[PDB]
Amino acid sequence: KRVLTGVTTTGTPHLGNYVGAIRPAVRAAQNPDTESFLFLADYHGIIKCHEQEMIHQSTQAVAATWLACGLDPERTTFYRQSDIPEVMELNWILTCITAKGLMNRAHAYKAAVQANAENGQEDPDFGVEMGLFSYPILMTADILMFNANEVPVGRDQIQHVEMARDIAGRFNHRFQELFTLPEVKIDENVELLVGLDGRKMSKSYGNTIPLWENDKKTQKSVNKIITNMKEPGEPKQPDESPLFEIYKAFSTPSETAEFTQMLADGLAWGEAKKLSAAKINAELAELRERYNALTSNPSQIEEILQAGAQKARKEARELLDKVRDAVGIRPLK
Numbered sequence: 001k002r003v004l005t006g007v008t009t010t011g012t013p014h015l016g017n018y019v020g021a022i023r024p025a026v027r028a029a030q031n032p033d034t035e036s037f038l039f040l041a042d043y044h045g046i047i048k049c050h051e052q053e054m055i056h057q058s059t060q061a062v063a064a065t066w067l068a069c070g071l072d073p074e075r076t077t078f079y080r081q082s083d084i085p086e087v088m089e090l091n092w093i094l095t096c097i098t099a100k101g102l103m104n105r106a107h108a109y110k111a112a113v114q115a116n117a118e119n120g121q122e123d124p125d126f127g128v129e130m131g132l133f134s135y136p137i138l139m140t141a142d143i144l145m146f147n148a149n150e151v152p153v154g155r156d157q158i159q160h161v162e163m164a165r166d167i168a169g170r171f172n173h174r175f176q177e178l179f180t181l182p183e184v185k186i187d188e189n190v191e192l193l194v195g196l197d198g199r200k201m202s203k204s205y206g207n208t209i210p211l212w213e214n215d216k217k218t219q220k221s222v223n224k225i226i227t228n229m230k231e232p233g234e235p236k237q238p239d240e241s242p243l244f245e246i247y248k249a250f251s252t253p254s255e256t257a258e259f260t261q262m263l264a265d266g267l268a269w270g271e272a273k274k275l276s277a278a279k280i281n282a283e284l285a286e287l288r289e290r291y292n293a294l295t296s297n298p299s300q301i302e303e304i305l306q307a308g309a310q311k312a313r314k315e316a317r318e319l320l321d322k323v324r325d326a327v328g329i330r331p332l333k
């Protein structure tokens, strides 16, 4: 039972990525009944992003984040997409059996087209580059290259797996059945983490809390959460500030219940914010020490990534030779 996930290397992870993705995934990859695959989608980074060191810095920070949070490379095959040349070969092969209409309907592309039309732009493809048009095929290669059974994705990403199933089927039928049809994996128990202003925490919203900061900075961050004008003795209900959902994401059911009655008995916001930052700090204190260790010694991350690549390519090449033979690429004998 092979479980496979791609993560972007396009920025530095925040608390929201920790609660909603990283922390659940690290726990979930400990199941001995699954084989665990996680890669950095660094070649997806050049689809749109362009800053010189953005990919390299986000790669180092995303790799250090997952490591610092307990991702075990002895358990998880952990690698950069840019260290698997087989994926790029597979990407061309799948391109040859993918219908253009499938890419016409890819959501990211439909959004670029509608945004031109929302902006009075009568050319639907204005500004569209082929990375945006074709990345669903590369994502399919990322998955099929290792014949993943389950691909843990958000709701947002469900189309992308359904597209891989579509391409896998068409390859299987045109050539031969080499690709298992991958399956979405969704956990309806991960609460997405709210930001400082009530909305879901997201880099594009400017409502994020950094994941890797010292206590005093984590405190100053927490002190920006929207509160209300209730008095240090006034009854505070939990639905009144995002602070409560923040405290909740870092506390047992019992502690949050205690926090509720604490608020209900008239805990001031300054103390509440103070307690929330401490919970966050307490959960993160050790991880933050490992993150600083790794980011200060990146060659340790590079070693781990090379060992991952070595493991990944061995299984990539086993499948690719089958695929190469199925599409007619064969030695002269």
Ligand SMILES: N[C@@H](Cc1c[nH]c2ccccc12)C(=O)O
Pocket: 004, 005, 006, 007, 008, 041, 044, 138, 139, 142, 143, 151, 153, 157
């Ligand atoms: N496209 C995904 C990341 C990703 C790339 N390739 C993948 C393959 C499998 C799962 C996820 C991925 C995202 O935007 O977050």
